[PDB]
Symmetry: D2
Subunit: 340 residues, 4 copies
């Protein structure tokens, strides 16, 4: 089967031939129709993070396709079912985290396209108990980004501890952020969108953000303090020092900021004002099986729709380069019927 393989961190991936896997007990093989690509896949192939892949490996944790083989003992899915291969490839199922519905925190979890081969190949070996069940009505290319961007922003909004009618700021209206506006609206929130690109901000308004502000033209924190009295919640999708700090300043007292991705390093942080104002700072970066199901249902109900561009597998190094310089709009999805 065709796969994009990373042999050495920071090298181009090689489209090459590899064996189709076969499933052991508890496993399935899924033939990919589509695979999302995101910045996480870029961190994987550059070996950026403290805990790294072991090359050679196949990246990708946003695969949609049909089950072509079922392993021993699997009964809740079957051949022909359409499923999703997401970041959480497996978890132990016995620890305090797994037992309490927080399997995203399991210390022995495996991650698709990172600690094991992923969705950048024509076929993927998966743990049947951890794949997403894809709703009937949806398109495979369009739904793929829900498996990563969608579930992420959705769980991240839940982690803002906000409620219908509250105001949430979405900082950064890119790959994640355009999904975040949509989930926030579906969750009955009023949205304030902040970015530095005017078109992104128009897109946000079209997706239902009643307030927008361009951080390059205007102090976002002064404007939102005056306009909405400060946000109840903030979801920071592009974590740079400045966006984080501005997002803190955009909150009312008792507000919650959720960092929805990993910044590159530490960066100084208010503390003093943070405690005075009863602020909460939390990370949230993926979602549980149930979060992913809820995410997918919202999409199937038409409440959320990803902007995608479909490309052949062969373009994956080009795609990374464009990513390296924020040239991507919406999300990029590999389409496995594009036979170059």
């Amino acid at each position: 089967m065709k796969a994009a393989v990373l042999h050495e961190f920071g090298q181009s991936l090689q489209i090459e031939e590899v064996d189709i896997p076969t499933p052991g007990a508890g496993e399935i093989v899924v033939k990919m129709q589509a695979s999302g690509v995101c910045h996480t896949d870029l961190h994987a192939v550059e070996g950026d993070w403290p805990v790294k892949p072991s090359p050679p490996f196949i990246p990708g944790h946003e695969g949609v396709g049909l089950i072509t083989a079922v392993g021993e003992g699997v009964t809740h899915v079957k051949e022909g079912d359409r499923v999703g291969v997401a970041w959480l490839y497996s978890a132990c199922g016995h620890c305090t985290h797994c037992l309490g519905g927080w399997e995203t925190l399991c210390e022995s979890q495996q991650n698709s396209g990172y600690s094991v081969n992923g969705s950048f190949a024509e076929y993927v070996l998966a743990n049947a108990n951890y794949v997403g069940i894809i709703p009937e009505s949806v398109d495979s290319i369009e739904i793929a980004p829900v498996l990563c961007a969608g579930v992420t922003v959705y769980k991240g909004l839940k982690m803002t501890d906000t409620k219908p009618g509250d105001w949430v700021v979405i900082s950064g209206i890119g790959g994640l952020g355009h999904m975040a506006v949509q989930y926030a609206i579906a969750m009955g929130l009023n949205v304030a969108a902040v970015d530095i690109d005017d078109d992104k901000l128009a897109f946000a308004k079209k997706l239902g953000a009643k307030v927008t502000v361009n951080a390059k033209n205007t102090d976002p924190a002064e404007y939102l303090q005056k306009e909405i009295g400060g946000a109840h919640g903030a979801l920071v999708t592009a974590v740079s020092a400045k966006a984080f700090d501005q997002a803190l300043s955009m909150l009312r007292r008792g507000g919650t900021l959720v960092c929805n991705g990993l910044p590159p390093g530490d960066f100084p942080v208010s503390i003093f004002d943070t405690v005075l104002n009863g602020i909460t700072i939390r990370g949230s970066i993926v979602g549980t099986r149930l979060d992913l199901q809820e995410s997918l249902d919202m999409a199937a109900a038409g409440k959320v729709k990803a902007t995608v561009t479909a490309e052949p597998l062969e373009n994956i190094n080009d795609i990374f380069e464009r990513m390296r310089q924020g040239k991507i709009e919406g999300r990029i999805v590999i389409d496995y019927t594009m036979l170059e």
Copy 2:
């Protein structure tokens, strides 16, 4: 009446004579039996913080005493009632924070012994709707610190989002921390105490902390990771950079760190690890009327007891000096029957 008056930030307070106030509508005058002193009074008299007192003023926000006059329209308390004058002097009662039981966040709150005269005088003018109602059974000197330290650590423990049977770390077993260990036990938590003083740590163990570690002799984080698998929550009572950072490292994934006081400045912060591990950082520094009532009931039930030392008002500058170099043990309380 006798009062300790601050005329100029950073100068000695003068014990001097001032008029006994009389109460307008909604107010009461309380003759003090006791007044706690804490670092917040020190920040008030040094004019350390961004928003400052307007000298000349009388500090103190931990006064216990008997009502001697009642203003127009006050019916729920009356002459002779023993009440507590705490940090929260008043709040607006109309804003979203006040209406939802978060009056500690009210943007037009007044603060005793900071924005208005407080408990470092023989009598105090107070808003009848914001004083604490002192339980029958308790001693006035002993109960005073509940009005500031006790409520603070109590609400702080609530804000760790822990539950009975969880492990909480109390970092710093000093004025606040020794009360914190007791509230944590009363709330069914297992307590790990960290400090750098061996006697403080023995005291903690005597108050019910099953685990103790001296941060000077041992990496506290490595030790608690191995010993208890990481704490579910951390209450940081002495906020220096190093204690904060170590406290982060003591948490298990999904844990919550509450800062229970104000540090002096910003200080770098993990972020990256914080988000990866699904950690929450939160500030909590005082408590609502209801929190204060709940704090006081726990004390009256004998579940919590402050270590206090009673001193005459005249010693207040000496007391501040000893504070400036960590010479205080437990809490210091001004005793208004100590007549010089």
Copy 3:
């Protein structure tokens, strides 16, 4: 000033002349532009409930108007401000319930148009700390029902412990229920509406209910168990024994049923199944000051709109007779600028 006064339980109210009150400390006087009417006013004037009014009294707990006098010490509102007089007239502000944001539970509360005079008069004396602050942009007649129906169904939906994407059944799509469907949609819920009137159910669908069932034609519980796998939550706006029991049966395991009004009596209840299925049964019947503010903001955002019919004060006994036989649609609101024409002789 003109007021509708109840002198004897169960008798017609008399439109008569009464002194305009003047405000003491902490109080205000509000000149009414509009007053909602509801079944709670009917229970009040019939003296139906265990704890009753003391006649003579002026009913009404859904008044919207402008402040015309401000008492001593009141500073957060002022003359000309538009405010709402609601069921919770006052609470003590000192008890556990009041301190914890649950003033609706205060054992010494007062209730507008029940334990003190209310909104069925051209002016009303009120406690300044308990009136609702009416958003700028709304109409006074249209907004009045938010003070009672809206806040009730809003807080009741919060009390279902559901979340966006969950399914809630609204049982009874009448005065309350039509507002309930709108709030439930604004709160990101999927809505299944149940009633026994087809037109009510069409209205519900128009308000965004994706699923509807006529309990007369079809077993509502069997249908919703098959169709949505059981609701996560149920809000019972018309509490008869049969609606209550069916609503229980419409829930999935771990679901929550909220009774949003007072039934007439006891009525047997499942228990056994309720405990087996991990079901929660809860009452929620009004809302705090903050719940009311949040309700009102939703309305002002255009997310909720009450169906109303405006009438002159002098129709209040006709209104109650219609109510006595389920003839009302939406809500009725007294409009203080509407006049009679007697067409004299």
Copy 4:
């Protein structure tokens, strides 16, 4: 192996010989050291409930013993590990309930000693992912009741939505109730115990209940309304109509009642007052794997200790007869090392 087998509902169980099972994938066999016995086993063997066992079957859902065989693919436990066989034998792992940490609600769950063979035999085949992990330090006979009574009352107290310093009433201080008082104390709650037996009530006080009331001598509700201003929560361990109704009356407004077991039938219920007072009624009858783990940790910490009486397997019909007339104190546990002495002829 020796097993107590129920062949016909309502008949004596037969101690007879049955094959030791062998484990398939995902399964283990556990050699029992101890087995609790409770009213749920009695309902099972009488075939009392709407959904019943399929005889012949081996009852028991409180087994403690050592793994003697491990099936294919099992890695998180191993031979010689001490584990607990509890009511929740298995769940699907794939539905909304299972994925959200509410596996106790799973519609395709299996129940030990009810829908599959349980702990009334010397060996039990179990699903490795659902057995409890027994802390090192505890005794096997003493810990067995935690697997059923303990987890039940523990999760039930969590479901009262109380917090440390609140007042909870434990109604019925028997098998479940005497554990409930200990858990409630460990959870920082003040405890009011109610029952109709003075000795039970003294025991409760000894376990830390600072308030007690004998419902036969005194109106429990009037007393607790005066004494503590009404409880925040109530846990009803013996569900008869009268206990349930009195427990409702013991709550303050906004209070929560949890029914911790299954009454025999429906029984009228307040509603009207319930909704007026903002009261919540909830069933909670067992616990998740995590609840069970937490229960067990509290016991191992010395915070909770079950009163038990150890008996040989062969007494199981005698045990059920004593149960049939409330002759049991604390809990009964079968101890697999205990032997009869027939004193033969």
